[PDB]
């Protein structure tokens, strides 16, 4: 079936059919309120949140050789 | 009883109830190998260990018999008066 002869496998049709659905699922995506909301949350909101937090704390702290009588804050 | 198993499966740790007829001979060689490596490690340790206080002469400190740092100190300290 794929080049070299492999061992006999009891290829279960249900499991094979599930594997085919996963390979072809992209062909059936549609924009709905649910899919748009999920896609917007994962792609825009969460990344922009980490981006905003990384932006606002960039350069805020330094630990190197900080003693008592000093601050971790740099800014 | 004891479980059945395939005789065609080769495993480095032995498999299922594995004991070769010559297990004592093989154990003797490997134990000899273990001693030889351990002795080399012992020789390295007795030369590369570092201490900052030496043991007192009357105290049970068997390392004094092989460690280079203490052996040099004890030999040098014997030159007194």
């Amino acid at each position: 079936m794929a080049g070299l002869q492999h061992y006999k496998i009891a290829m279960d049709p249900a499991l094979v059919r599930l594997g085919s659905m996963i390979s072809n699922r992209y062909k059936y995506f549609r924009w709905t309120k649910r899919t748009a909301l999920v896609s917007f949350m994962y792609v825009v909101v969460v990344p922009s949140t980490i981006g905003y937090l990384a932006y606002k704390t960039d350069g805020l702290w330094d630990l190197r050789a900080k003693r008592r009588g000093d601050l971790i804050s740099e800014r | 009883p004891k479980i059945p198993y395939p005789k065609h499966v080769w495993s480095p740790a032995g498999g299922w109830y594995a004991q070769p007829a010559n297990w004592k001979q093989n154990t003797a060689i490997f134990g000899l190998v273990i001693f030889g490596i351990t002795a080399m490690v012992w020789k390295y340790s007795a030369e590369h260990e570092v201490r900052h206080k030496m043991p007192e002469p009357d105290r049970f400190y068997p390392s004094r018999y092989w460690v280079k740092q203490i052996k040099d100190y004890e030999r040098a300290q014997k030159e007194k008066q």
Binding site: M1, A2, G3, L4, H6, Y7, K8, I9, A10, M11, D12, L15, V16, L18, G19, I22, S23, Y42, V43, V46, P47, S48, I50, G51, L53, A54, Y55, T57, D58, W61, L63 | P6, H8, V9, W10, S11, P12, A13
Partner: protein, 494 residues
């Protein structure tokens, strides 16, 4: 003749011999594969000789050849510490990739060997060229052979995979080319020893960064630009997959050390938070989807995405340990992903003809040698200490943390999630019951061939995991040159 040209010439000779030996002897295909393998061994022997002669603390490019015959496009070859280890990775991986396909390539064997030999020359030329436009030429040259390799030897979905990797890489690269051409126009050339002395103005740097970053994020790949990899790395033949994940992913990383760090320092520092948000998002999203991936080769392919996020964050850390850790992780990923692709795309796939996880269980009972190497490889993927993967992950993660703490803390969560998908995948295949009831025949354990490609790969990760000085010592001096910044009482000495 320079030793670096010998490196590029030996595989071309083997291509010539493979294509002409039918006229001096139906020649057996074993002869063809013997020629290609010995060709890769000699290329490896030459790279070892270069490394023995290589000097660890020189800021002059070594083993260069004077041209004095300048043309419009001249290939200048040179090596320093930040490229020497990628050359070694390419010359070690290439023989292993050839042996991994010794039996599974059954038709068109001459074409397969010539493509792999040509891939060796082109990938090596990427690490050795001393001109930025030469870098693009070699970076893009590997696409047609890769398109043909996937389409002639790939699995059922090979056409869609071949198109994806070609069009994604081309599209990203076209934005890099526009960035390179702008540099070439301002400076007058893209030769390294001239362009690295140029000082681009800040707004130029920003628009140069975008365009180089777009290409490198397509090639990293970052999450969301990574469907070409999830297709191509799976549909590829086994030797193609090893080359694609061990060497081709490393091009964007070595590219950062030549194209961003020395010439775009101000844009790189000002945009690190955008790089870090993308790298942080990639670490979490790729990890969660790896946990739900049911194709065994796709799961190993998706974990490459999560590891490459950490070396990408380490390369933008602007710290010595983060930069060295990035190179260390890149190298450690090359040995580990090669071994896990061999375990899945070469051992499981050859025996069963399927890549679905649902059909595997309890393989330890009948395949103890496979389960031993597969487990050690899965610890490497989880970044377990005593592998070079821990040393690279720790140093990369420390530099990312010190540069931007919130980004490092999220990136650190990889220590939890890489373990999760590595241990989950190991347990479901090797453990998790008795031997799967879907297997009608029993399976043989590793053949001598499979054992000695896994043992060799496992050897490299463990030896370098215990003595990583073998790479770091040749990295320290050259990698100093890409750091940007100053200490107040250390700078401007008089």
């Amino acid at each position: 003749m320079s030793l670096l040209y010998v490196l590029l010439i030996i595989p071309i000779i083997g291509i010539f011999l493979i294509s002409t030996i039918d006229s001096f002897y139906f020649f057996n295909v074993s002869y063809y594969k013997k020629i290609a393998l010995i060709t890769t061994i000699l290329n490896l022997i030459v790279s070892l000789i270069i490394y023995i002669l290589f000097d660890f603390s020189n800021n002059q490019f070594q083993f260069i050849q004077e041209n004095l015959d300048l043309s419009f496009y001249d290939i200048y070859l040179g090596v320093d510490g930040v490229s020497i280890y990628f050359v070694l990775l390419t010359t070690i991986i290439m023989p292993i990739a050839l042996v991994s396909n010794w039996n599974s390539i059954t038709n068109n064997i001459k074409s397969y060997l010539i493509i792999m030999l040509l891939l060796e020359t082109l990938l090596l030329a990427v690490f050795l060229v001393l001109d930025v436009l030469l870098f693009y030429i070699f970076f893009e040259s590997i696409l047609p052979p890769l398109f043909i390799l996937i389409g002639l030897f790939g699995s059922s979905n090979k056409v869609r995979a071949s198109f994806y990797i070609f069009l994604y890489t081309l599209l990203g690269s076209l934005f890099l080319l526009l960035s390179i051409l702008t540099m070439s126009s301002i400076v007058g050339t893209t030769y390294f020893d001239v362009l690295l002395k140029s000082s681009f103005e800040y707004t130029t740097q920003l628009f140069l960064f975008f365009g180089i970053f777009i290409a490198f994020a397509v090639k990293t790949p970052v999450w969301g630009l990574n469907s070409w990899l999830l297709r191509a790395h799976v549909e590829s033949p086994l030797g193609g997959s090893i080359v694609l994940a061990a060497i081709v992913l490393k091009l964007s990383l070595y590219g950062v050390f030549r194209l961003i760090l020395p010439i775009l320092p101000q844009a790189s520092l000002n945009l690190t938070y955008i790089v870090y948000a993308i790298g942080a998002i990639t670490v979490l999203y790729a990890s969660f989807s790896t946990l739900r991936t049911v194709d065994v080769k796709e799961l190993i392919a998706y974990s490459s995405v999560a590891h490459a996020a950490i070396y990408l964050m380490g390369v933008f850390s602007n710290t010595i340990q983060g930069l060295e850790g990035a190179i260390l992780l890149g190298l450690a990923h090359g040995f580990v992903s090669s071994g896990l692709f061999i375990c899945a795309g070469g051992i499981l796939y050859d025996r069963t003809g399927t890549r679905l996880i649902y059909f595997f269980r309890g393989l330890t009972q009948i395949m103890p040698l496979f389960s031993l190497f597969f487990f050690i490889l899965c610890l490497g993927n989880a970044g377990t200490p005593l592998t070079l993967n821990f040393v690279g992950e720790f140093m990369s993660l420390y530099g990312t943390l010190e540069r931007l703490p919130i980004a490092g803390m999220l990136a650190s969560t990889s220590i939890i999630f890489s373990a999760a998908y590595s241990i989950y995948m190991y347990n479901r295949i090797a453990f998790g019951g008795s031997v799967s009831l879907y297997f009608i025949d029993c399976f043989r354990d590793l053949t001598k061939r499979e054992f000695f490609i896994l043992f060799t790969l496992v050897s490299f990760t463990v030896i370098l995991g215990i003595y990583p000085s073998f790479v770091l010592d040749g990295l320290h001096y050259n990698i100093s040159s890409v750091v940007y910044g100053i200490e107040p009482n250390a700078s401007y000495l008089t």
